[PDB]
């Protein structure tokens, strides 16, 4: 008798990027990922379902060999913007010869009454002005679900020297986050207007921008 297997292929199934689902210029994709695929049994067959109905547009990524002598095997299904937002369920079914049966995972958008982000821009502290670079802050609160995109711009150009905190659960069950843009103090002192852009389902046109400037 063989000893019994102590594990096998795992499937992880990942939603679209928030921004992709909210801009009809972009294409949102659901991604199905299989790890611990053995070299003895490396083929993965993928089948996709939307509200239980089969769809045939998945793209098949080439397998990725890993340092631990397994494969990471991926399938990527592009979805329709409004299907995702209307709360439809995407099901990845994964067949591999190491398992006697398929693994099924399902993803959908978080459920809950959507709620509009409140966006507020907060200038640098007077105390921080002793430094060469200063901190512009955007607080986004009151929003649900947690899928959101935040960016910065100035004067028609994107600003990329920022870091955004992950969403944090607030006491009322909504979410909040902060984003920090770091700029050279000189730029702020000149009177330049920097802008915090937020994309989310519960905003009109899925978008808002709030401005921040010295005056």
């Amino acid at each position: 008798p063989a000893p019994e297997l102590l594990g096998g292929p795992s499937v992880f199934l990942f939603p679209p990027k928030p921004k992709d689902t909210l801009m009809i210029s972009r294409t949102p994709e659901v991604t199905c990922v299989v790890v611990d695929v053995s070299h003895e049994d490396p083929e993965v067959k993928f089948n996709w379902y939307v509200d239980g109905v089969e769809v045939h547009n998945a793209k098949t990524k080439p397998r990725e060999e890993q340092y631990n002598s397994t494969y990471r095997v991926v399938s990527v299904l592009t979805v329709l913007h409004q299907d995702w937002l209307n709360g439809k369920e995407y099901k990845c079914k994964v067949s591999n010869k190491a398992l006697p049966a398929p693994i099924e995972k399902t993803i959908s958008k978080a459920k809950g009454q959507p709620r509009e982000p409140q966006v507020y821009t907060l200038p640098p502290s007077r105390e921080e002005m002793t430094k060469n670079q200063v901190s512009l802050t955007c607080l986004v609160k009151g929003f649900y679900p947690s899928d959101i995109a935040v960016e910065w711009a100035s004067n028609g150009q994107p600003e990329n020297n920022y870091k955004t905190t992950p969403p944090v659960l607030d006491s009322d069950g909504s979410f909040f986050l902060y984003s920090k843009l770091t700029v050279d103090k000189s730029r702020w002192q000149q009177g330049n207007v920097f802008s915090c852009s937020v994309m989310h389902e519960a905003l009109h046109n899925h978008y808002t921008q709030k401005s921040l400037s010295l005056s």
């Binding site: 063989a2 000893p3 297997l5 102590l6 594990g7 070299h39 003895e40 340092y67 631990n68 002598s69």
Partner: protein, 297 residues
């Protein structure tokens, strides 16, 4: 009172330590390199916590290198490509480094590589790895599926090389029984005599040994290197000498008593098996041969 009368058997190529202190908890000889034995020692960084199998194999490999030291340098000139494990563009292991660091308990290249590249997600999973299988993967290059725990079947369908190993592939091939250098034996259910007898033969035939044992939990057992054994006039084990990757580097070689415990099981303790000292039951043995029948060819 009878005269003391002990037959001591030690691994091919291993000088028994000479100075043995009695410590508060164990009788031990501190590590001195180049005496032929090895003490890979875990740092417990989150990755090596449960990697005693890869450590015991590591120590068996470092011995193997010492035994086969001239044939191995000749092999690496003949096949320079086996001086490195490449993953495309990146370098994962240099066989030259393994050799120059093998003396280091805490920072051998061979354990770093096991911990960091080959088996980094095992401790998180709360499984470990079978020593024999690490060896069959490192030398012959037999693929190691970490979820499959049976001994290597040479006649198996998947015969391709593991990209983590295969260093001595061109002598120790896959598919030939005769080139598999490893064994594994179950000791549950077996007698002091039977176990004593198998350890004597394997040492005497020139194998390196690893010994697994219960570790006072229901779920996960331990494995160590068994470097020498003492037997009585009746030829039963009295004692063994071991290195252990969970033991810090200042301890080195430990003497363990052997003997049947209260509950009728063969067991091992830093102290004498008697009274309430029930020790850890011994569970199985792992074996590595030099492969010199094959090297000669």
């Amino acid at each position: 009172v009878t005269p003391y009368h002990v037959t001591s058997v030690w691994t091919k190529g291993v000088t028994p330590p000479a100075k043995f202190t009695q410590g508060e908890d164990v009788f031990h000889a501190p590590y001195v390199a180049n005496q032929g034995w090895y003490d890979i020692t875990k740092t417990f960084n989150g990755k090596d916590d449960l990697l005693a199998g890869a450590a015991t194999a590591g120590n068996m490999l470092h011995w193997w290198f010492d035994q086969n030291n001239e044939k191995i340098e000749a092999y690496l000139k003949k096949h320079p490509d086996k001086q490195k494990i490449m993953f495309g563009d990146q370098e994962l292991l240099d066989v030259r480094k393994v050799i120059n660091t093998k003396g280091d308990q805490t920072n051998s290249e061979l354990f770093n590589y096991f911990r960091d590249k080959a088996f980094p997600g095992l401790s998180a999973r709360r499984i470990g790895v079978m020593p024999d299988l690490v060896l069959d993967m490192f030398i012959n290059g037999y693929y190691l599926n970490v979820y499959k725990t049976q001994t290597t079947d040479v006649n198996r369908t998947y015969q391709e090389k593991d990209r983590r190993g295969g260093i001595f592939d061109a002598v120790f091939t896959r598919g030939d029984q005769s080139k598999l250098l490893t064994s594994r034996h179950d000791f549950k259910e077996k007698t002091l005599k039977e176990i004593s007898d198998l350890i004597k033969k394997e040492l005497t035939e020139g194998k390196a040994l690893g010994l697994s044992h219960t570790y006072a939990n229901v779920r996960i057992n331990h494995v160590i290197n068994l470097w020498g054994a003492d037997f009585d006039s009746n030829g039963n084990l009295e004692a063994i000498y071991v290195t252990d990757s969970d033991s810090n580097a200042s301890i080195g070689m430990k003497k363990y008593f052997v003997g049947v415990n209260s509950a009728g099981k063969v067991a091992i303790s830093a102290k004498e098996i008697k009274e309430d000292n029930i020790g850890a039951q011994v569970l199985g043995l792992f074996t590595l041969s030099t492969g010199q029948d094959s090297w000669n060819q």
